[PDB]
Amino acid sequence: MVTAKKDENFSEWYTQAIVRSEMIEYYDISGCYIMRPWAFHIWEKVQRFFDDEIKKMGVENSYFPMFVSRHKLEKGFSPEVAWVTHYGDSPLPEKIAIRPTSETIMYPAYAKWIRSHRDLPLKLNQWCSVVRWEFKQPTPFLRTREFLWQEGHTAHATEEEAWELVLDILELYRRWYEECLAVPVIKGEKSEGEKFAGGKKTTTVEAFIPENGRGIQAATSHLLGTNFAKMFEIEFEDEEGHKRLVHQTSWGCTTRSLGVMIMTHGDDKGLVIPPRVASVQVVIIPILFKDENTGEILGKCRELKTMLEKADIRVRIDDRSNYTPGWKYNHWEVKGVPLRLELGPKDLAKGTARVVRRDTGEAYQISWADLAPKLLELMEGIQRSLFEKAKARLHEGIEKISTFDEVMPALNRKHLVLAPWCEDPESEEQIKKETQKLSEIGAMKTLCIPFDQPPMPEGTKCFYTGKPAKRWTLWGRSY
Amino acid sequence: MVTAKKDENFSEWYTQAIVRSEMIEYYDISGCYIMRPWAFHIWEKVQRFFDDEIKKMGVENSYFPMFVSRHKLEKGFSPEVAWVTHYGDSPLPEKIAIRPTSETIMYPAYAKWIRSHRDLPLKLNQWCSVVRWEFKQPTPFLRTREFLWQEGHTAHATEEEAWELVLDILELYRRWYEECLAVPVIKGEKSEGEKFAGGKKTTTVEAFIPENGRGIQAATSHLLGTNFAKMFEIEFEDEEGHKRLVHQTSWGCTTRSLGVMIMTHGDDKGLVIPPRVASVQVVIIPILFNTGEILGKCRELKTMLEKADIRVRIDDRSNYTPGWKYNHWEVKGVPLRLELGPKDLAKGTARVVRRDTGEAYQISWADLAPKLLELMEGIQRSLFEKAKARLHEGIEKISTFDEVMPALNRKHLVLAPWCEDPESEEQIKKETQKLSEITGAMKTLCIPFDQPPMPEGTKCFYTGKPAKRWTLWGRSY
Numbered sequence A: 001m002v003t004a005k006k007d008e009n010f011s012e013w014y015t016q017a018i019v020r021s022e023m024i025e026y027y028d029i030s031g032c033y034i035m036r037p038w039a040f041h042i043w044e045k046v047q048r049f050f051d052d053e054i055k056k057m058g059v060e061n062s063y064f065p066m067f068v069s070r071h072k073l074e075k076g077f078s079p080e081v082a083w084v085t086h087y088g089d090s091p092l093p094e095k096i097a098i099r100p101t102s103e104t105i106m107y108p109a110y111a112k113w114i115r116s117h118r119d120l121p122l123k124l125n126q127w128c129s130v131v132r133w134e135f136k137q138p139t140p141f142l143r144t145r146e147f148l149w150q151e152g153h154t155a156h157a158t159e160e161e162a163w164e165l166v167l168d169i170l171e172l173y174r175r176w177y178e179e180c181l182a183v184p185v186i187k188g189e190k191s192e193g194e195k196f197a198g199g200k201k202t203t204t205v206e207a208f209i210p211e212n213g214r215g216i217q218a219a220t221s222h223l224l225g226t227n228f229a230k231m232f233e234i235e236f237e238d239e240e241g242h243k244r245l246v247h248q249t250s251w252g253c254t255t256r257s258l259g260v261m262i263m264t265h266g267d268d269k270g271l272v273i274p275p276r277v278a279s280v281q282v283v284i285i286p287i288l289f290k291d292e293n294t295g296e297i298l299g300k301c302r303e304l305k306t307m308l309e310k311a312d313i314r315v316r317i318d319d320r321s322n323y324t325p326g327w328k329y330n331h332w333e334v335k336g337v338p339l340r341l342e343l344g345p346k347d348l349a350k351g352t353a354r355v356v357r358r359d360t361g362e363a364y365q366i367s368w369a370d371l372a373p374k375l376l377e378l379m380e381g382i383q384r385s386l387f388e389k390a391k392a393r394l395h396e397g398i399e400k401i402s403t404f405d406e407v408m409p410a411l412n413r414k415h416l417v418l419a420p421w422c423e424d425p426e427s428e429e430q431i432k433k434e435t436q437k438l439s440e441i442g443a444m445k446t447l448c449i450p451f452d453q454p455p456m457p458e459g460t461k462c463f464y465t466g467k468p469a470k471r472w473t474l475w476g477r478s479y
Numbered sequence B: 001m002v003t004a005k006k007d008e009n010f011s012e013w014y015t016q017a018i019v020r021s022e023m024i025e026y027y028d029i030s031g032c033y034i035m036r037p038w039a040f041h042i043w044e045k046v047q048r049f050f051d052d053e054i055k056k057m058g059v060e061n062s063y064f065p066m067f068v069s070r071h072k073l074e075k076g077f078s079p080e081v082a083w084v085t086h087y088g089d090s091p092l093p094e095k096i097a098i099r100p101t102s103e104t105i106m107y108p109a110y111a112k113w114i115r116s117h118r119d120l121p122l123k124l125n126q127w128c129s130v131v132r133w134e135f136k137q138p139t140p141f142l143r144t145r146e147f148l149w150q151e152g153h154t155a156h157a158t159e160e161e162a163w164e165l166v167l168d169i170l171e172l173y174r175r176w177y178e179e180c181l182a183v184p185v186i187k188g189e190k191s192e193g194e195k196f197a198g199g200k201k202t203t204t205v206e207a208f209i210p211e212n213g214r215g216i217q218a219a220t221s222h223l224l225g226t227n228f229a230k231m232f233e234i235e236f237e238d239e240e241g242h243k244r245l246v247h248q249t250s251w252g253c254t255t256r257s258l259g260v261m262i263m264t265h266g267d268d269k270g271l272v273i274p275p276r277v278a279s280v281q282v283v284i285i286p287i288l289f290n291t292g293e294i295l296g297k298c299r300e301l302k303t304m305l306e307k308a309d310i311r312v313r314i315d316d317r318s319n320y321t322p323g324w325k326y327n328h329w330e331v332k333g334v335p336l337r338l339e340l341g342p343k344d345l346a347k348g349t350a351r352v353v354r355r356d357t358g359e360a361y362q363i364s365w366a367d368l369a370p371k372l373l374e375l376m377e378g379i380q381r382s383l384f385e386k387a388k389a390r391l392h393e394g395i396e397k398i399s400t401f402d403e404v405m406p407a408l409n410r411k412h413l414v415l416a417p418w419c420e421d422p423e424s425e426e427q428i429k430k431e432t433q434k435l436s437e438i439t440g441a442m443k444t445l446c447i448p449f450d451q452p453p454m455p456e457g458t459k460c461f462y463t464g465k466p467a468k469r470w471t472l473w474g475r476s477y
């Protein structure tokens, strides 16, 4: 059972939620954690969703090696690279790196495979793990030294096509968070300071954690332009016979998405799992005490299960004899199962079951015949309700502002700011260092420049420099 | 085109088939290979099959870290372990190993999670890669330094329930090979010398490669007994409050299965992929050297076949003749080619050619979906049954040690009555090695579940002592 309160010590709440729900087991190698089945089933759901969707785009899965040779890799990231130096007691002739990301592993093959327009677009993805020796404080799911992800890497004849894929993938990430995990996200573009330096333009979806006021990057999708094509000699011949550079994209999203879901929907009793990604949508609990009707309770439970499955409802009967009914309520609650159905002798006689929804704790008396459609209705309710409350909290957490003098107070309130900005280079660093300084007495950075821009009245000035502002940019402390 | 003949230069045939089909891309780190979509799709297919099946048994997926501390890992195999000693320019406090297998990572967690009979059975699996710095020559799929696999590790209150699971998992590996890959395998028990030394009994599915006469272990399923439970202190209180040791199993199968399938079904033109796992089951080739008439029809045919869950691609590439395309998709092993030219358009028919035999069929458009489903089932089954007959043509039943070298020289396995005493296996290994020299060694592959009749008073082929069971032996991978 969870005892830390979400609104008091947040980090201790998160730790308790993930351990006691049996999502995570701690591990002796710092920054790495065991994903137990209750968390893994969720990853399988979002994984199957994203994967199905990219397959409709013609993206194919592959698998490239987890090792890259020193010299290929080495053609502020260097301190993060894990190096294999020995096999048994023998030193490798040359040390070898574990993949922090796969550009240096995939792009030489791309140069080889692409010869003409007939070879494009090339669209590949892989699901795998990557290793980065993160210097920031690690946190399960959100920042780990080994994490699971997919990375997609595509190559196109033209920028327009490449860019169209960038946005398509970004929309899939919106759907992963918003439609599967009921977590709202803001699409936007990274500032010049925050974008992937290997690319032309980096797009993102950004989420927000109210309890610590932290913005967090949810996924990423890069228009790479042609710089990688120039670096790796990825060229093709047009249908006219000339040699052209390819236009590339890459995109990735990780098990971080699970941590974001946990933090968003969790409460003081622990986990709350959105029905769309819950492996157990409805747990059925037989109420057994003093031998009253034991066999008839269990029988109708099996009957209800079969009925609910016809409607594609994912149902588990917890008929384990070595646990009390009250232990079961607690167990499945801390685990965040969206609906609990209880069946004792009193309920049995009536042709009804008592059903409790995990998000609000509301109980329903429902007749056996109304079950399938009532539960489907409740599950859409839960899913939509989880999302809309999270959305309202996201919007309560963002403050529209005009001047730097408004910044520090908004941060103390654990909010982000949407502020007009000239998008100058020195600016962001200045702002980072200064909010850094005022906080110590930490830093605030740009999260993104939202795609959805409020109007910009003529003559409005950059909130920091005083110069003419360009667009509204979202800022805050972040992960 | 593939030019090395499969029977005459098998090693070069293999390399040619996997590269020219675009399954595999070579790579600068030894024993590591890129798996391109044409190969990877097949992996997703067998993975989806095996995963769906173990989920029916209540096995649940998880992900344990790829790193294990030196202290945990070291609680024979030592030279194979890859060690990380630095991050960037900084030395670690102690070296950390990349997982060559996950026992030392999982079993301490199991010792914590298992306290009571009600925690049992515990049934976990993971899909991941493992790394082993193999000393033997690397071979794409069959023996790689990084490989993809699943490993299942379970714990039970009793040996009986553990053994039940061992056998159910082994039956699933038989299915993975025989049903998905159309590769016949032989269930068996490993000898004392060949079993996992950390377990009580190892079961296996064994396959045969006729072109080089070598047996190859296809997958493995172990009754671990209680020794890991002693080692890691995995105990539970039973119903009476008594501390008991759990009974364990583990099992694994790798991307090696893809290479076994390639070798089993390939021919001189290249790959033949069983319809149940092919990325493309039906390639539609328009006979063109556009107005929209032929392509238009190809799209309609595709749509109609996709309605029947047939995986289709139209090869509408501009720069290539039909004959070039035929060969291209043959080398890739697409089981069915659908040809559509002006004469076909004119007659409402399409010509279909199956990759395994080259038989051609004239089929009306209306009939395509049902006839192609039926051809795919016929191809899948016919691949299996021809490979099955080749497996059994590759095994010689013998009585005496003098029958051995002639059998091995015919690139055949041998089935012989064996007394199963510990020392004779090593002796047979050494003796067949030395005779070969005049990887030549003959070892046991498995003691098959399917035991041929054993006449009363039959002697061990080697020691002459009384013979227990028939054992299958051969050169192997």
Ligand SMILES: Nc1ncnc2c1ncn2[C@@H]1O[C@H](COP(=O)(O)OP(=O)(O)NP(=O)(O)O)[C@@H](O)[C@H]1O
Binding pocket: A101, A132, A134, A141, A142, A143, A144, A145, A147, A149, A217, A218, A219, A220, A252, A253, A254, A255, A256, A479
């Ligand atoms: N260490 C990590 N653990 C888990 N998820 C991560 C980690 N690092 C990055 N991510 C997520 O993976 C996505 C793509 O990774 P990438 O864009 O390479 O990260 P990044 O540039 O290193 N971000 P950051 O580490 O904050 O500077 C990011 O948008 C994050 O959502």
Ligand SMILES: Nc1ncnc2c1ncn2[C@@H]1O[C@H](COP(=O)(O)OP(=O)(O)NP(=O)(O)O)[C@@H](O)[C@H]1O
Binding pocket: B101, B132, B134, B141, B142, B143, B144, B145, B146, B147, B149, B217, B218, B219, B220, B252, B253, B254, B255, B256, B477
């Ligand atoms: N290097 C490898 N590459 C690909 N598949 C492998 C490799 N090593 C083992 N396998 C397969 O994975 C299965 C389970 O692995 P395991 O039982 O640990 O192998 P093993 O005991 O090392 N066999 P061997 O290396 O021949 O002595 C084996 O039965 C093989 O089918």
Ligand SMILES: O=C1CCCN[C@@H]1CCCn1cnc2cc(F)c(F)cc2c1=O
Binding pocket: A077, A078, A080, A081, A100, A101, A102, A103, A132, A151, A152, A196, A220, A222, A250, A251, A252
């Ligand atoms: O963000 C993506 C999506 C997946 C493809 N890669 C891009 C950029 C990745 C940014 N990134 C992130 N982290 C890294 C860490 C390293 F150690 C390293 F060598 C490189 C990187 C690195 O390039």
Ligand SMILES: O=C1CCCN[C@@H]1CCCn1cnc2cc(F)c(F)cc2c1=O
Binding pocket: B077, B078, B080, B081, B100, B101, B102, B103, B132, B151, B152, B196, B220, B250, B251, B252, B253
């Ligand atoms: O048979 C399997 C597959 C599923 C569970 N794991 C076992 C492999 C155990 C045998 N084995 C096999 N190979 C190993 C290689 C190593 F480098 C190492 F450290 C350990 C091993 C090792 O234990």
Ligand SMILES: [Cl-]
Binding pocket: none
């Ligand atoms: Cl070496």
Ligand SMILES: [Mg+2]
Binding pocket: none
């Ligand atoms: Mg980073």
Ligand SMILES: [Mg+2]
Binding pocket: A194
């Ligand atoms: Mg950054």
Ligand SMILES: [Mg+2]
Binding pocket: none
């Ligand atoms: Mg080995």
Ligand SMILES: [Mg+2]
Binding pocket: none
């Ligand atoms: Mg061995």
